[PDB]
Amino acid sequence: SHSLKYFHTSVSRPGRGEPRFISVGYVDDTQFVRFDNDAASPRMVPRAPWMEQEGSEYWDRETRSARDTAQIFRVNLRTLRGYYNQSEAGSHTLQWMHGCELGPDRRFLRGYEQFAYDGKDYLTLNEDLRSWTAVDTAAQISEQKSNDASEAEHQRAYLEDTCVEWLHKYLEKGKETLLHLEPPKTHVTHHPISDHEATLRCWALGFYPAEITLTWQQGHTQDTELVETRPAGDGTFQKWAAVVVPSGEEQRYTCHVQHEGLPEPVTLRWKP
Amino acid sequence: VMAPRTLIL
């Protein structure tokens, strides 16, 4: 499965001037485009090397698209004040996220579209993609405004057709990058504590996509230290799980790695 | 491509 997601953000700036609009495009676990109004150069720019050579029609469309969204979001911000009874003193956030997910077959599986005020669920497009549901008592006016103007129909066409159509295009554009699977480099490192305590770590480094599984056995559930999947900085990801080991008896514990890049799930132990 | 339209709240 592959998905085309977009993360749009607008932040009101009291005294600093016009609000700041920033939108980022994601083909799978890869950021491929971005837009920013803070620059004097306010255009949609390539953030993946496969987008670097695309032509100016595409860059013209996406700039005018993002430009228009920024204009509306600016107004939406002054409007959102009236609802929550706010002043020109506080800096507030307006976030919009949308995306389509393909199936294991190759065609549309699901789609989503959510709006949020100050990082809190505001208005959400229904699962059916036919209408809107307010997740806040102040969104009620914005909802029974959208539902009456058949707004969900515009978003339905993009999510079901456009989003999907273009996603295939981008996946083909960078087959050698996106569709190529990088399996994780795995190693177990030992960091002792005292006479009894000791720490054993399972390092999963250089993997794509970020969806991975790392667990310690004897099924050892009680107090496992696991870190969030962090970006390596080169496009791949990193993750590790640590366990409290009673000194000497190390072979009693086993680490299991599960990722799409591996044909069979790999198990590991520390080499002294 | 990002959505061509948006919501006027």
Epitope: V75, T79, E153, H154, A157 | -
Partner: T-cell receptor, first 115, second 111 residues
Framework: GVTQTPKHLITATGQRVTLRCSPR?????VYWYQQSLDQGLQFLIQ???????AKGNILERFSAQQFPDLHSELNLSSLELGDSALYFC???????????????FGSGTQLSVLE | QLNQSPQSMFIQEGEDVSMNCTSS?????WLWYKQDPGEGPVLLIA?????ELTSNGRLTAQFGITRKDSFLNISASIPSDVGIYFC?????????????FGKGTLLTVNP
């Protein structure tokens, strides 16, 4: 709510003109249309909350702008004999209103370009 | 791009008139205007949903399940209806505040 200035205007070939718009109170968008004598209304330019939103095949000699208050102006240079038309002003985009997309027109400016 | 046929209708008072509007793309909102010589276009009916038919007395407009057609009917035709009828629409997938117009249909009501 939409009010246009002037009503009837008459100049000569090669000169310049300025046309005013006072949109509805609360409406952020302004549109400019060129309805010829029978040749249907053709879109020129649209502004939204001060900035230019959409353009529609303007001759380059035709200028325009929207101010901090939602007022607008349409500037016409090297006025040519062919430009003799009924220029209309439209207003919409009041996030206060529920009918938003709905457009409202003002009684157009009758412009004539003689030699 | 929108197209209104038949461009002109020479009719007799008391009769009923139908007006068609066909587009070259799927639409989401339909707007019906009337323009009197010199006067600015004034809104008659606005359609938002695919199946709905909406009215203002003698005037009735339809959306059309096709999403590329809209109709305008005038019940009793007093010679007051003499005017140009413009059809407008919100093309599906278009950005906010983008709406197309037609050349309009001229209605002539004979006494």
């Amino acid at each position: 709510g939409v009010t246009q200035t002037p009503k009837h205007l008459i100049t000569a070939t090669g000169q310049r003109v300025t046309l005013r718009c006072s949109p509805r109170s609360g409406d952020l968008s302004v549109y400019w249309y060129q309805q010829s004598l029978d040749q249907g209304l053709q879109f020129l330019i649209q502004y939204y909350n001060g900035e230019e939103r959409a353009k529609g095949n303007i001759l380059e000699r035709f200028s325009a702008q929207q101010f901090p208050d939602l007022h607008s102006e349409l500037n016409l240079s090297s006025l040519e004999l062919g430009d003799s038309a009924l220029y209309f002003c439209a207003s919409s985009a009041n996030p206060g209103d529920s009918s938003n997309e709905k457009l409202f027109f003002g009684s157009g400016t009758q412009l004539s370009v003689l030699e | 791009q929108l197209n209104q046929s038949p461009q002109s209708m020479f009719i007799q008072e008391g009769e009923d008139v139908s007006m068609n509007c066909t587009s070259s793309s799927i639409f989401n909102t339909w707007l019906w205007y009337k323009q009197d010589p010199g006067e600015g276009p004034v809104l008659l009916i606005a359609l938002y949903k695919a199946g709905e038919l909406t009215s203002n007395g003698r005037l009735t407009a339809q959306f059309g399940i096709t999403r590329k057609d809209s109709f305008l009917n005038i019940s009793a035709s007093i010679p007051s209806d003499v005017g140009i009828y413009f059809c407008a629409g919100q093309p599906l997938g278009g950005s906010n505040y983008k709406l197309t117009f037609g050349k309009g249909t001229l209605l002539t009501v004979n006494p």
